[PDB]
Amino acid sequence: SHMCLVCSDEASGCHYGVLTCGSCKVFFKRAVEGQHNYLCAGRNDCIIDKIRRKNCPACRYRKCLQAGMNLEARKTKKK
Amino acid sequence: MCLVCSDEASGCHYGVLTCGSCKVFFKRAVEGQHNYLCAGRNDCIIDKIRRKNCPACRYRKCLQAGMNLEAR
DNA sequence: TGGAACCCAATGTTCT
DNA sequence: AAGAACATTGGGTTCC
Ligand SMILES: [Zn+2]
Ligand SMILES: [Zn+2]
Ligand SMILES: [Zn+2]
Ligand SMILES: [Zn+2]
């Protein structure tokens, strides 16, 4: 396809195992490598689009996980 | 306690009892015009920590708590 | 009390 | 591809 599977913006290729845009790529890396201690102000089902993806990092990080992102995807595609 | 984010207040600002962070947010919201979109259901929880998540919902309840720049 | 000017945390792009 | 590090935004406290 051509759209990020997390936020629907224009994907820039496959990162951490998932067709995503560049903003979701570095968001995930940051969330996964530090704490991801986020709280949703809604009911854990926020809509995450190009502009709203900024509102709710809890729900953004859940959609990254749901789309299959994982740090070791490179090492894992091998074998 | 902030009538908006229920943190605790520095005093009465723009017509309402609010925290300092809500003071500046409002001034900025009203002046800068931006158009904000809620990502939930137009009823987000607005508290000390979750404030920053939905400026649409934050700004809406500033308005509804009575905030207004001409409080003269 | 209202506002300026900080300062920092979080985002998204560049990297020639 | 991954990821440092740059640029910028939006935000809260300090100060005047
Ligand atoms: Zn994305
Ligand atoms: Zn959410
Ligand atoms: Zn407040
Ligand atoms: Zn909202």
| Subunit contact A42:B37, Cβ cutoff 8 A | no
The CATH number that applies at residue B60 is 3.30.50.10
Q: How far apart are CA B53 and CA A53, in angstroms?
A: 10
Do the beta carbons of residue B29 and residue B55 sit within 8 Å? yes
| Data resolution in angstroms | 1.9
SS3 letters for chain A?
Answer: CCECCCCCCECCCEECCEECCHHHHHHHHHHHHCCCCCCCCCCCCCCCCCCHHHCCHHHHHHHHHHHCCCCCHHHHHCC
Q: What letter does residue B10 receive in the DSSP assignment? A: S
Cβ-defined contacts of B64-67 (< 8 Å, 24+): B65/B3, B65/B4, B65/B16, B65/B18, B66/B15, B66/B16, B67/B4, B67/B13, B67/B14, B67/B15, B67/B16, B67/B18, B67/B26
Q: For chain B, report the end-to-end CA distance as a whole number of angstroms.
A: 23
Q: Which residues 8-67 of A interface with strand C at a CB distance below 7 A?
A: 21-27, 30, 53-54, 57, 60
Two structure tokens written together for B46? 């607005």
Strands A14-15 and B11-13: unpaired
Please tell me which of the candidates B38, B40, B53 has its beta carbon nearest to residue A43: B40
Positions on chain C within 7 A of a protein C-beta: 1-5, 10-14
Strands B11-13 and B16-18: antiparallel
Range of the domain at A37: 1-79
Number of domains in chain B: 1
Q: Between helices B55-65 and B20-32, what is the axis angle to 10°?
A: 100
Q: Quick check: B69 CB within 7 A of strand C? A: yes
* A51, amino acid identity: I
Residues of B in Cβ contact (< 8 Å) with A40 = 50, 53
Check CB contact of B37 with chain A, cutoff 8 Å: yes
Q: Whole-number Å distance, CA B47 to C1' D2?
A: 37
